[PDB]
Structures are given as C-alpha cells and as structure tokens.
Design an enzyme around this catalytic site. Structure first.
Site, mmCIF file in Angstrom:
data_model
loop_
_atom_site.group_PDB
_atom_site.id
_atom_site.type_symbol
_atom_site.label_atom_id
_atom_site.label_comp_id
_atom_site.label_asym_id
_atom_site.label_seq_id
_atom_site.Cartn_x
_atom_site.Cartn_y
_atom_site.Cartn_z
ATOM 1 N N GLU A 110 0.794 -1.209 0.000
ATOM 2 C CA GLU A 110 0.000 0.000 0.000
ATOM 3 C C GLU A 110 0.833 1.270 0.000
ATOM 4 O O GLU A 110 0.420 2.268 -0.573
ATOM 5 C CB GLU A 110 -1.005 -0.056 1.150
ATOM 6 C CG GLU A 110 -2.003 -1.175 0.885
ATOM 7 C CD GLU A 110 -3.126 -1.280 1.896
ATOM 8 O OE1 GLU A 110 -3.314 -0.361 2.721
ATOM 9 O OE2 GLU A 110 -3.847 -2.299 1.848
ATOM 10 N N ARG A 170 13.115 -22.271 19.846
ATOM 11 C CA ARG A 170 12.927 -22.081 21.278
ATOM 12 C C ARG A 170 12.098 -23.244 21.794
ATOM 13 O O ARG A 170 11.070 -23.597 21.198
ATOM 14 C CB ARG A 170 12.226 -20.751 21.557
ATOM 15 C CG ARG A 170 13.069 -19.579 21.113
ATOM 16 C CD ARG A 170 12.523 -18.269 21.577
ATOM 17 N NE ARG A 170 12.299 -18.279 23.011
ATOM 18 C CZ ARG A 170 12.285 -17.184 23.757
ATOM 19 N NH1 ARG A 170 12.494 -16.006 23.186
ATOM 20 N NH2 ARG A 170 12.058 -17.264 25.061
ATOM 21 N N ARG A 195 21.364 -14.595 22.789
ATOM 22 C CA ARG A 195 21.024 -15.936 23.249
ATOM 23 C C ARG A 195 22.224 -16.813 23.599
ATOM 24 O O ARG A 195 22.161 -17.595 24.543
ATOM 25 C CB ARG A 195 20.173 -16.644 22.194
ATOM 26 C CG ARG A 195 18.794 -16.044 22.034
ATOM 27 C CD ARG A 195 17.989 -16.737 20.945
ATOM 28 N NE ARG A 195 17.697 -18.141 21.246
ATOM 29 C CZ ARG A 195 16.865 -18.898 20.534
ATOM 30 N NH1 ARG A 195 16.238 -18.396 19.477
ATOM 31 N NH2 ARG A 195 16.656 -20.162 20.880
#
Ligand code: BJE
Ligand code: BJE
Lengths: 241, 243, 241, 242, 240, 251
Positions: C78, C166, C221
């Site tokens: 858009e 995870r 992590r």
C-alpha cells in the site's frame, strides 16, 4: 459395463447415491448382508461390489483394495455412476497409549503420507472429512455406545517403512520416516492406515462427501470390534441417505 | 510480573479460563466480551488486547491476534501457556463461491495452508483441521440463530494481495505459484480466503489444543454491522457449549 | 479519504514522499518521526500507524508494519501504491553469534527465508537481498556515529518460538525442520533472528523497490541501543532522498 | 503364516527365489499354467499366489493388486519369505504414436509419479530396473520375435488424473499434471502404468533384483480407455534368471 | 571457425561422427584418441578439448566435458547440435561399497541425481537412466577386455566435498541434507560417487540421445577420503 | 607437490595471498594477471589454471574455476584450504533487461539459485548474497574506471541452454520449470544470466569467506544486433580492469 474397472453400469446402482467402501473385497458381502435386499453386482481385480437397501434406498458396498491408487479408481468410477457420498470402514492400529483394542476411531482429517492425494490437490490442501459424514459416524458410534476417539490419522502409502516398522527384510527406514511415529504421536495423531489421505482429498476437492471410521485391532504402543465399526458405518449411512 | 513475553498476562489474570475467543482486531475484543458477564479489560500490548468475561459462571478470555499467522502464533502460544486449551476464531470475510451471499456464515472444517507459520509446527502433509467439538458447537450455534451456514474448506493466505491472486497492485504481477490459483480453489470447493486459520488450526491440532473458526461473509469478489453481530453471537453461543 | 485499503492514507497525505522508514511497533513511529523536521501524525489503523516528517526539505514517511510478513506485505504494498520507492526497516534484535554483543548494530545484506509471505512474490531460489544503496547508507550512517557494526545475513522467521528453535514453550517441542536449526544458522554465519525482513526484502527486490534493514542488538542468546539504531536509520534516510 | 498379508510360509515357496508378480490376481493362475507343477497357494485380499516349477526350480507367481502401496506389501513379505528376484508383468497405456496394442514394453527405469517409492528412497534415487532382469526380458522377447520397445515408463499413483485422463467425473486435472502427458511424450517416455516406480525403487534400494514388462492395451495418443506374448516373455525371462 | 558457441567445432569437423567418448579431463582426450585410428586434434577451448578418430572405418569424437553437469551439459548439447547421437562417458571414481576394489570397473545403470543441471531437462521424478544398448555394450566390452566389473547405481554429486560427505575441508562441516548421506547411499546399494552422470544420463534419456557410463575405481571411501579406457573404446566399437 | 587434490598448489605458492580473482576460462587467467605486477604462472590442471601476481606490493592469486558451480566449488574450497579468504569473480555476460546495454558493467548483490551446488552448502532459504565489502569495492572501482554500472540480482543457472530458456537447441524444448522463466526474471528485475555466482556466493557467505561478482555485458537477449567479434574483448577489458582495481581495496 460403463466403467473400466468396476464392471458396473448406472442401472446396477439403482439410484444409489451413497457407498460404503471397505478395503477388503471379502468384507463387502458381510456389510451388505447387514442391510435389506443384498445383491452381488460384480467382482473384478480387488473390486467387489454389492447393492443393498437401507430404509427403502439403494446403497452400494464396494471394496477399494489396499492403498490410495486402487482406492482412487473405485471412488472415481463410483462417482461416475452417481455416488456422491463415500464412507470408508476399516481396521487399524493406534499409536496413542490410551487407545485400546476395540476402540472406534473417526477421522476428522489425515496426514498425507501418500502420493495419490497429490493427483487431486497440492499438499497445502487438507485431506479433511465431510462434516455431515463425520457427524453421522460420531453419532452412530455413540448410538451403540462405543469408546470413540475423533481426530487425525496418518495415511501411509506403505504398511512398513511409512509406518516406521523395522522388522522387515532390510530393517532399514529411510530418513524421511526415521523417527516419524514418535513425531506423529506427539502431534496427537491417533493411528496409521493406508487409504484416507487419498479418499478424503479427492472427495473434498471434487464436491464429494467422505467419512472414515475404523476399529482398533492392535496398538503399537477383530471379530467383535470390526463388528462394531461395521454396525457404526451402516448406522451412519442410514443418517446420510 | 507477566508470565508471558508479549501478552503481559499472568495465569492468575485468566481466573481459571480455559477457552478464548480470538478475533484478529483488538478493537473488537471489548464488543465480544461485552456479550458476556463481568467483562473486564486485562491488557493491551501491540495488537494483543485481552479481556476476561464470564460465561455461565466460567471465566472466558477474548484476545486479539493481529493480522497474519506470525502474530497469531505468538498469541496462541502464550495463551496456551496461561491455560487456554480451546480457541474460537471469529471474523468477517469475503467469499470466492457464487452461491455464498453477503450475510451468510462460514464454519471452517480445515484450511488450505498458504501460510508459512503453520510449517513451524507441522510438515505440510499435516492437515490444518479444526477440532470436531468446536466445529460442531459453531454449526449448532449458527443453526440456533437460523443463520444460512456453509461448512467447508478455507484458503489461508500469508498475503492479502498476491496469495489471493489480486492484480490491482503496484506491480500488477502475481508469481507463478499463484497465477490462476483462485479458479483452482473455487473448483476444489474452497469457500473463501482469510489470513490466520492455517496457522491457528495447524498449531492447535498438532499440540493437543482445540480450535474452530466461524466468519460472517461481508463481501463476494465473484459477485457489515448485522453480519458481524450474527457471527459474534454464534461464537459466543458456541463457547457456551464448549466450557 | 483513503487511496488504499488498510493504511487509511491518500497520496496527498505523503506530500511526495518516496522514502519510508518502517519499524514494526506503532509506538516507535512517533519517536522516529520526532528526529526529523515538521513531524506530524497521519493515521492509525490496526497495526499500521503512520507519520510524515521532513528531512533536508523532502517529505519522509514513518509507518509501522506490525509483527510478521503478512501485515508487513500489506504495509509495503500500500505504501508502494502511494508512491514509496525506498523502504528502511529499523528494529531491535537478539543475536545468535557469540561475538555479536548487545549495543552492536546489525545491517542486513540478505535474509534466510523462513517465512511464507516472501514466496507469494518470488520462488525460494530468489534472494531476499537488500538494495545496495540502502545498505551502504545504513553502514555509512552507523560508521558516522561510531557504532560497532556487523554487516551480513539475518534469519527471518514466521514464528517467535519454534522457528527460532525455542523450546521454552507450551509443547516444549520443535518440528523436525527446525530441530538443530539454530546451530546450523550459526555455523553458516547468520547474525540474528527477526520476523519481517525475508518478506520485506524479497517483495521489494522482486518489484523494483529499494529496501534495507538495520537493528540494534539488545540481547544475545548464546549467553540507548534503540536510540542509536533510530539515529542511524534517520541519518541513512537523509542520504537516500 | 510367516507374513501378515499373503498368508504364506517359507515352506510354501519350496526354495523359490524368483517371483513373477502380475497386478491382476486373476492372471496369476494363467501365468502359473504355462509352467510345470502349478499349485495354488493362497488368496487373501488382492494377493493371490501360486507356485510352479521351471526347469526343476520352484517359482512363485503372486498378484500385487493395483498400485505401489499394495505392491510394496507383496514385495516385502515375499522378500521376507525368501524371494530375491521379482519380474512384474502388467498391462499399460502407450503414449507414443508408433506403439501398437499388444506390443511388449520392457522398462529400463520409471518416472516416479507415485508416493510409496519415497518410503524407500528420496526422489533423487532412480527407479531403475536390475540389469540382469532387463537383459533376460529383452533376450526372451527377442527369442520369440515379439514386437518389443525398451525404455522409460511413467508410473502413476492414479489411473485418471496422474495419467492426464480427462474423461472423468470432474473432467479436471490438477496443475501438476495438466500438460504432463505431452511432456513425458516429448521426453521419450513410452507408457503409463501404476506399479513399476514403487517396485523398481524398493528393490534397487534394498538389494533385490527387479524386471518390468507389460503388454499394451491402449494407445493414449488416440483414446483414454480401450473399447499372452508378454506373459510368455516374462516366463521365458524367469527361466534365464534361476 | 565454429558452428557452436563453446566447443569451437564445425559440423564438417566431425566427418560424419555420430558417437562421442566424453572423458572429464581434457588431458585424457589425446590419450583416448591415440587408442584408435587416424587421431586428429580438432580444438581446445576452456576445458573442452576435442579430437577426432576412426574406429572400424567410422569417425568417432573424443571430447572432454570438464567437471560437473553444467560444463557437461554444454559439451553434450553442442556435440548433439553437430550430429552426435551416442555419448559414452569414461571416468575415475570413488567406490563406497567395501566389496568394490580399487582397479575395479563400474558400469552405471542409473544415477542418484544429487546435481542441479539434470533438473533443467527433466523434473526430479524422471530417472537418470542409461541407455540399454550403451549399458549392454559397456558390460560386454568389460568381458572382452577382462576386468572385475560391477553394474549398478551411482550417486552423481554437484560437489566433490560436501555432496560426497567429505569432511577434509576448510569448514569441516557438511550441510544437513548430506550429513550421514554416504552410509545411506551405501545401505541402498549405491556403488560410488562421481559428478557428471546424473546430468549426462538425464539430459540424454529425456532428449532422445543414447548415453552410457563406465569408470575405473581409484579409491574406496570405506577406507579413505586403463581397463575402463579400453572398455569404453571397445564399447564404442559395438555401438557404431 | 600439492596441498590440494585438484589445483596442484601449495600454501608456499601463494606467498601469503589472501585474495583470489576467479574468472571462468583458464585462458583468461594470464590476461587478468597481466594487469598486475610480476605475474607468474603457478599450475594448470584440468580447467584450473592459476597465476600469482602482486597488487600494490601484496600477493594475489588469479585462478580459473571452469564452467558451473561444481568445478567452481572445488576451486573455491581448495583455494580456501590454501588460505584465500576473499574471492572476486569476473565474467562476461548477456543481459536480459532492455535498458542494460552492451559494454555496461554489472555488479551482483545476490543471485537467483538456479544451480545445484549451492544446496550442498546451504538450504534454498539461505540467500546467495555477495559480501558487502567486496560489492562496495567493485562499485567504487567501476566509478574509478568510469563505467556505466548496474547493481542488482543475477540469475545463476546450471545450464547455458534450457535454464536460460534458450530454444535454439537440439531438442528445441524447455522443461516446464523454465518455460516462460526469463520473462518472470525480467519482471522481477533480474539483470542477467551467468553460471557460477549462485554456487560461489552461497558457499562463501555460509562459510565465513568474502565473495564479490562483476561482469561486462557482451550481449543482450532482448536486442537484435550482436557485438562484432570483439563482443567481449573491449567490454571484457572494462570489467577486468574493474575487478583488479576493486581487489586493491580489499587487501
Ligand atoms: O498398522 C496398520 C494396521 C492396519 N492398517 C494400517 N496400518 O493401514 C492399513 C490399510 O488401511 C489396511 C491395509 O492392511 O489396513 C490398515
Ligand atoms: O493406462 C493404463 C493401462 C493399464 N494399466 C495402468 N494404466 O495401470 C493399471 C493398473 O496396474 C491395472 C489396472 O488399471 O492395469 C494397469
């Protein structure tokens, strides 16, 4: 004959619009004998067909043979003759610890571990059963008060490797299926069978209604049980005429 | 204090709720909860706005998912972590079948997986199927309202434009995979396009969670107040039978 | 009132802007816009909040995309329809390389397509590659403020949990495709995980639109940041007008 | 029974190591009758089995039923019973204009348009026939002077859409197969059948030998549905493989 | 100059040749051609070195393909454009079966398609199968020449290292798809690894061209990371 | 002596070189090396011809890869074992965009993986993307030399014919996958077709190695006229000088 494999004509069906499709041709007559006016129609290859009546309406019982390939032929030619509703009744082996022998399994949809289903729709399309058929089967199972499980079924093109069986000639299981049963189990899959993925996909993708019910014979983790399944499919059919 | 990374809720906040009605738009959450007893707001973060209500003495959650499976997967996962075991998707949709008219209600049995998130839960072979009890409750509830209902397959797309074979775009192009895809789904009996069910149904069916979806038809590309309300009454009535 | 279906915008609203900075969270749109001249609110619909500002006398748009490729594909399309030709994504991320520390700045050259939306624009063989001018502007902008920068590949996932491998989840399980996947991405040099770039870069690179991405590492992590990442994206935008 | 479906014991084989496997259970007896000491063994579902003798060597004839799933069961349990060489004898639809009904086609390898072959090897693995079995089949056809064609066969999981047949209930063919027959034809594929891909793949990938021969019953370049030389050949061929 | 883009050959250069022996190494072209009559060097561009020769009074071509299906696909296509209808590949190979010994000759019936070029001629379902007559000539020629021959499936890899699950590399890692693949091929009966047959066999089998392949074993992977040549020449002799 | 199986090279041969210019044709190696100081031939085996030269006083390697990702993967892998950490591919190509003229220079940011070898290093989802520093060096070098440059995506095919949708062939047919593909790539903005970048970019980006790709347009698939007989020659020199100039900035 109007169809190449079945050896049946439209007139043979006598207006029948529903068909019970077991896998074993030797189980055809037994199911038909449970209804009114059972009459043998034909027997070619693995396709044995009989006509019977249920509440004054003609119904067909036709074996599919083992596997999606032979199943696709029976369904296609029956459809060409006018059948619009297919109810598969079978025997099966559960993979969930809580599912006991004699239990009834009604399939909502199947894990597509076959090749034929792809000949009707891409893998993204769900091998899902018809709601009315599924409802009829669940209500019929309850009707005769059977321990019923409603859920997903893994439909494999093989009885051995695809169902991760190692007690085979080679004892080998190709990577794709190595560890698959535990995977399916964790995903809530109830059992393994070899025709629903094709049946359900080709039906749901062509405006045909299809359902699937099966009696648990063994658990990886008949007579009276198969009797139950057969009674259930016949009672379900009665509600779909 | 929150037990989850995104919803900003604790299990305590649910007060024992085990069922959640999950609309996509957060600005529809309160309206849905308003139809039940003791509607209280819980939280709002990103497109996840949650309210708690009570249905026949049982707590129920209404939480928005946002647009798409990625956003939906976060809401469902965290809600599941908070104790929700049943999810009822409510929405408004267009239709790709000529016989489906605006105002009709669509109950989805399974979805065509035209998304990506579903594959993070189960391989493509796995069916994005709805729970039987949820689908039954929706069909029954719809019937009680006398709504014209269509039960079938829905095509769940990751895009609003190309995946739904829209050519009125900046590029005016549709990748090979989707060229001519709409007529294919139509021929296969697909009822409509929407953008979250494939992810919702697949992640639930493959993780022991119950899911169902109902939608009000507001438009038909082959050819919304009242339509939305009916669908909403149906989803609330269905929830009643699933508590 | 609106020339597009979801953004609630008209071309007039953009005032000729051809560049759009696209964060994911609507809450960050005002903050980013605040760093430029004459910032003003435009609209807010679903996860799409837009503002317009000015840089060196040229109108600039800041619009949120929401979470994931589906909503992002709607915003990008858009905005493209309204006249936007260059898209700069800004975000905060969690690295997976032992030597990428918090506070570091990541500029993505291309992404691993672990999404579904990218496939609705180009087949998998097509690269989810960032535009060169954009990548250059971001890198140079990062250098200008002395940030510790890392330029490379990013893994773009349709999920926050299993897709990023995870296991701290409800099911505690990760589908086969993703089991052991993080270690592989790490060994392949992948810098981080995020959820919108595969869609953004693929849809822009395959439709003649320019796109780039920069993110601040706020966690790692394998064991103020946002303000600098925002400073960088605004400084990079200036060079692309 | 030593196996779950065939209802046979190893004793029923009498040392047999080769099996002629037709698809139609009604063709088993006809095939057994061309050999010595034919004896019916069993018949369960689509698996009808007979035993015969060729040059004083026990030989098994067992039907597979239609398709790879049914075929994979027969092959596996026959393998467990001791069979090491399989010769499939079937019927087929030719897709090349020069092939006549009645012509014998020997398959060197098959286009895997099935699903069961994937349960034994990834798609990259060729559904190739054993060289000794293919040689024996070609040599046997040469010895009786039958019109023979040697080459690739397309093995489909369906009889209708997968073989691009449009004379059906729906009259449509999924995207994947629309225009497929023309493609196989341009690639030189000789025919269509539904079991070779599974048979050849599961055998080639598990140390089992397999040959594939079929008689043409319809020419697809002309019609979708039609209105013993292949059998003689498969038996002669088996004689050379004992 | 040349009727083709890469080979640098004209149709007149083949003197009617309809069969080509295609080794991978351009340095073996002259040596192979030297085993026949009237060997004449034709051209040398890139890894495409070609010689023309005579066998039983018929023109034969010997043209190197270079390493891999991409390079091979060009050689085969352009040779076909010039009239070659039968291609016999001769190569070196690493066996993955313990019973196959170094010095043994291998004849490939079909190949595991672990390449990319074959997909440019036929979808993956299509078999990378060798021509029956060519395979038969190779097997029969092996008997004539005398050699420990093995006939079966070959794994054709687009890489020499990860695709053949070699770890003696810079990264020392093998991508998921190929981790543990060699024992998988071995359990499936695959005889060896090489890098051109999948492409050669598929593109010929799907385009009406005859192809066959033989190779000499120069190492056994279950241990470490002239017959063949005489056989391919004798086989060509049976196919002219 | 050789530390590698195919190249016939030893680490000593490199004299500490850490960058390699990798053209496809072994006959071009000597030409590229001639743009640098003290070039000397190292070895020649199969389609792998290598030379060593000096660039601003630093050792640099020029080694041919042969055609396609398979031979390319061997060269890149063995050169890496020898110590090379940066690879610059230089080629000649045919454009598929009407606006890209013969003589123009193309710098590839990433490639459409229409090959098979790239998959032997990373699954298809992984981008066959060029290293940022290398791409920057190539773009800047093009500016120093002064060429008309285009920066974007390249379709890297395993075949010169069907994969690049060429019908002027023996069979004259193109398998379903590539039927109408060139038009699809054109609409997606793909600049050209070549045959080694998907493999080269993917194997380097997934193993900590730097790779860049530059090429000169010697022909356009959408135009009628075709460059004399010096299609490459002048244009090829343009690209060649640009890759050498770029190398200087990556030492
Ligand atoms: O382990 C089992 C046990 C039973 N079945 C099965 N797997 O799938 C089989 C086919 O539907 C049919 C073929 O025997 O029976 C179903
Ligand atoms: O077009 C054809 C013609 C014949 N066959 C075939 N396709 O496969 C069919 C099954 O194996 C069996 C039943 O159709 O006969 C094989």
């Amino acid at each position: 004959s109007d169809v190449f494999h079945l050896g049946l004509t439209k007139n043979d069906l006598q207006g029948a619009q529903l068909a019970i499709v077991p896998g074993d041709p030797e189980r055809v007559e037994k199911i038909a004998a449970l209804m009114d006016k059972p009459v043998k129609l034909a027997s070619h290859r693995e396709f044995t067909s009989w006509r019977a009546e249920l509440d004054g309406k003609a119904v067909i019982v036709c074996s599919t043979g083992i596997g999606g390939p032979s199943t696709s032929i029976a369904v296609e030619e029956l459809a060409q003759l006018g059948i619009r509703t297919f109810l598969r009744i079978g025997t099966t082996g559960a993979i969930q610890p809580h599912i006991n022998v004699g239990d009834v399994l009604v399939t909502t949809a199947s894990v597509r571990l076959d090749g034929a289903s792809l000949h009707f729709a891409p893998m993204e399309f769900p091998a899902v059963a018809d709601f009315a058929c599924t409802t009829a089967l669940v209500e019929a199972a309850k009707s005769i008060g059977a321990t019923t499980h409603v859920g997903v079924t893994a439909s494999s093109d093989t009885f051995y490797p695809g169902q991760e069986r190692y007690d085979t000639y080679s004892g080998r299981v190709v990577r794709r299926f190595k560890g698959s049963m535990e995977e399916w189990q964790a995903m809530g899959v109830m059992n393994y069978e070899m025709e629903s993925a094709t049946l359900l996909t080709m039906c749901a993708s062509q405006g045909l209604r299809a359902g699937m019910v099966a009696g648990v014979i063994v658990n990886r983790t008949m007579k009276q049980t198969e009797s139950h399944a057969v009674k259930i499919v016949v009672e379900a059919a009665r509600r779909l005429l």
